C-alpha cells in the first residue's frame, strides 16, 4: 500500500527510502547479463536523437539562448542523478513537446514586456522548487490513487500515435527537400538531389522489417535455445548495423547523417555565459516579476507531475511483473528539485519520457523459454538494475566527443527504429485489443472478462468514448491553445468518477475499466 | 488404375476417352463461380510475359525467322485445342528453356551445312508425328509407373529455383542499365536515367508484399466469411491494380512497360511467308536430310514426353484431391501431333509448363471454411472445368489488339508477381519440409512417417542425395552440354530402382519415398 496516507510529515518519502534502498546490492548485481548491453545500445539511439531535434527547434525559437549543447548537458546530468538516487531507476528523463510549448510561450511573453529571459527562468525554477517541497511535505502524492486506467490508456494511446505521425512527417519532408525531377542540371545543405528520397524510404523500411522479422524469430523453433535468445536480444542493433553497412556500400548518392556539435561550449558565447546571475546581468531585475513568477511555476509543476506520475503508473502495472517496489514520492521530489535548480545555469527542464521508459522496460523483460505449443508466451521476470540508466545518460553526455563515429549513420535507419518503437508500444494497451474487437464478428470475441459480463453494444460505447477523448485531446494540442493540454487531460479523472456511473452500471465498470 | 497394360491397340486411349468425356456437361457447368475470374486474370499475366521474353530471345537467336508473333499464335492455337480436347484441361502449354536450346542448336547446325532452317523443321515435325503415333499405338505410356516421387521432387525443386533466379537477374539487369550516378547531364531505348532503378525495386517489393499479406488475410479472424473469401481470391489482381495505379501517379520518371507487336503479321515479311513448302522454296531439299531428320525428332520427343509426363504426375497427386480423372495417353498424343503439325507453318513447338500448371491448380483449390483454431487448413476440393484454359489461351492470342492497355503496365509489378509464384510453388514439395527439418533441433521434428520410422542421420542422407542431384543438373544445364539435360534427368529413375535399395532398407525407402 504505497498510496496510503500516514499523517506524518515526509512519511511517504521515508517509507519509499526504507522500501527501496536495502535492495541496492541486488540492483548493482542484476546487471551482469547480455541483455543489458543490447538494451543500452537500443535506448542510447532512442534517446540521443530527440535531444538533437528539440535542441535545433529550441535554438530556432529562443534566438540561440538555448540550443543543443544545453539540452545535452541537462539530459546527461539529470539522468545520471535520477538513476543514482531514484526509487524507480527504469524511468528515462528527457524533453517533450509541452515543455517546448511552454518555453516558446514564455520567451514571447518576456520579449513582449522587455525582460531578461534567463532571469525569469531562474525565478520560475526557484518557485517550482518551493512548490514541489511544499507538496511532498504534505504527502500530496496520494491523489494518484484516483487515476483510473481510463486516463492511462488515453494518455499512452495518444502519445504513441503522435510519435508515429511525427516519424512519418519527418520521412515526408525529405521528398519535398529532394523532389523527383526529369532533368538534374549540374551545380549550405544540398538541395534538389537525385536518388536521395527513394533511398531514404528503402533504408527506413528495410530497418523496420529486419527488426520486426528478427523479433518474430525469437519464438520460432529453429536453431538452439541459446542462439535464439541471443539473436532475439540483439535484433535492433543488428538491423541498425546491417542498414548502415548497406548505406555505406553505396558511395555515389547524398544522404543526411547525424550531426553533433563539437566541444563543451555554450550555443552563443557572446550573448551569455554558463551561469546566469539571479539579480540581472545588463539591467536590474524588477521585484514585481520576482514575486509574480509563481504562475508559470504552477503550470510547470502541473505538467511535470502529470507526466511523471502517469508514466510511473503505466510502468508499474501488476501485469508487467515489477517486484523491487515503486516510488511515488521520491521520484517527484527528485525531478522537481533538479528541474528547479537547473534554471540557475540556463538549462531546460526535464520530465519522464513515456515511450522511452516503456521501451526501456520492454527491452529488459525476460519471457518463459518453456513456451506452450501454440500459445502466447507469458512474462517470466523483469531485470531491475541501475546500471543501464547511468550508462545511457553518460553516453548521451559523451556523444559530444564521438561525432566522427556518429557522422557515418544516416537518419532513415533511425526513422525505421522509431517506427518500430511506436508500433511495439501500442500492443501493451487494452484499448488496442478492444479496438481490434470491432472488426471481428460478434461470435469471434475472446473470453476476456470485459466480453462475457458486458453486451457487445455496451462494450463498444466505452471504446467510442475513449476514442472521442483521444481525438479531442489531439485537436486541442494541434491548435494554438496547446498550453492548456495538461489541464484538459486531468479533466478526464472527474469524468470517470462523476459521469460514467450515471450511464454504466457498477458491475460493468468493474470489468471494463480495470 | 489408368497405368495398367490392357494388351490391345489404342486401349489406353479409348479407356481415357470413356472415363473423361462423360463429364463434359459438368466441366462446362463448374465454371460458374467468382474464383474462376481471378484465376483467369492471374494466369493470363503469368503466361503472356514469357511469350514476349522468349519471342525476343528467339528472334535474336534465329536471325528474325521466328519471333514474338509466331510464338503468340502457336501458344493461342495449341492452348485452345488442348483445353477443348484434352483429358487433363488443367495443364498449360507454353515455351521453355530446353526448347530454346534445341532451336538455337538446330539453327547453328543448319547454317553449318548450308540447309534451309524451316524445311528441316518441317521434316523434323513430320518424323515427330510418326514417332508419337507409333509410341501411343503400343500403349507405351505405362512406363510412367516407374517415376517415383524422387524424380518428381527433384524436377519441381530445380524448376522453381531457376524461375526465382531468373526474376532476380532481370531486376539486376534493370539496375545495370540505369546506374546511380552523381551527375546526370542532359544529352534507341533510354539509358542512364535517374530514379529508375530504385523505383523499380520499390514497385516489385510492394507488389510481392501486398500479395503475400492479402493471402495471409484469408485465414484470419476478421470480417465476415464472405468478405474474407472474396478478398482472398482476388489478392493478386488487387496487388497488380494498386501498384499500377501507384506507378501511374508518379509522372516524372522513366519506367519500362509492356511492349506487344501490333497486327497479325510474320516477323520478317521479306524472308518468309506463313506457309513453308516442304519440298523447298529457293533450293531443292536433299533427300538425305529428309531421311536423317529422325534424330532431332527423337530428341524433341524425349524432351516433350519427359516434361509433359512429369508435370501430369505432379499435378495429379492424391494429396491434391483430383476426382474427375487423369490423362496419360490422350494428352501425349494431342501435344505430339499438334507440335509436329506446327512445323509446316513455321511455328515453334510447345510443351506443358510446370510452374504455370501448378499455379493454375493452386488458384482453383477450395479449402474448408471451418478452419480449426490454430490448425492448418484442409483442402476441400479443386474446381475442374475447361473454360479457364480456353479463356487464357484466347486472351494470349488476342493480346495483339490490346497493346494500348498493355503499354501502361510496368514490368516491376510482373517481377513481383513472378517472385510470388516461385515462392508459393516451393511450399508443396516434401523436399522443402525435409530441408527445413535440418535446422530444427531433433526433438521438435513432426510426426510424419519419415520421422518416426527412420533415424535422424538416415533421413538427412536422402536429402543430401537429392540436393546433390539438383546441383549437378543445374551445373550441367548452365554449361555448353545443356542439350543433354533431358537425358540426365531420366537417369535418376534407374538410380532409385537399382542403387538406392543397396543402401537403404525396404521400410526406410517405403517411408521416405511416399
Residue numbers in the entry:
A (entry chain A), B (entry chain B): 673 to 859, 884 to 1210
What does the paper say about this structure?
This study unveils the structural insights into human AE3, including the cryo-electron microscopy structures for AE3 transmembrane domains (TMD) and a chimera combining AE3 N-terminal domain (NTD) with AE2 TMD (hAE3NTD2TMD). Our analyzes reveal a substrate binding site, an NTD-TMD interlock mechanism, and a preference for an outward-facing conformation. Unlike AE2, which has more robust acid-loading capabilities, AE3’s structure, including a less stable inward-facing conformation due to missing key NTD-TMD interactions, contributes to its moderated pH-modulating activity and increased sensitivity to the inhibitor DIDS.
The structure of hAE3 in the presence of HCO3− and HCO3−/DIDS, and without HCO3− supplementation were determined with C2 symmetry, reaching overall resolutions of 2.7 Å, 2.7 Å, and 2.9 Å, respectively. In general, human AE3 adopts a homodimeric state, and each protomer is composed of a transmembrane domain (TMD) and an N-terminal cytoplasmic domain (NTD), the latter remaining unresolved in all three cryo-EM structures. In all three cryo-EM structures, hAE3 TMD consistently adopts an outward-facing conformation, demonstrating a high degree of structural conservation compared to human AE1 and AE2 in their respective outward-facing conformations. In TMDs, the cryo-EM density map was fragmentary for residues 860–883 in the extracellular loop at the dimeric interface and twenty-two residues of the C-terminal loop, and thus left unmodeled. In the AE3 TMD structures, the dimerization of hAE3 is primarily facilitated by hydrophobic interactions between the transmembrane helices TMH6 of the two protomers. Key residues oppositely arranged at the dimeric interface, including L894, I898, F905, and F909, form hydrophobic pairs that contribute significantly to the stability of the dimer. Notably, the contacts between the TMDs of hAE3 protomers are relatively sparse. The inward-facing state of AE3 is suggested to be relatively unstable and transient, as inferred from the dominance of the outward-facing conformation in EM observations.
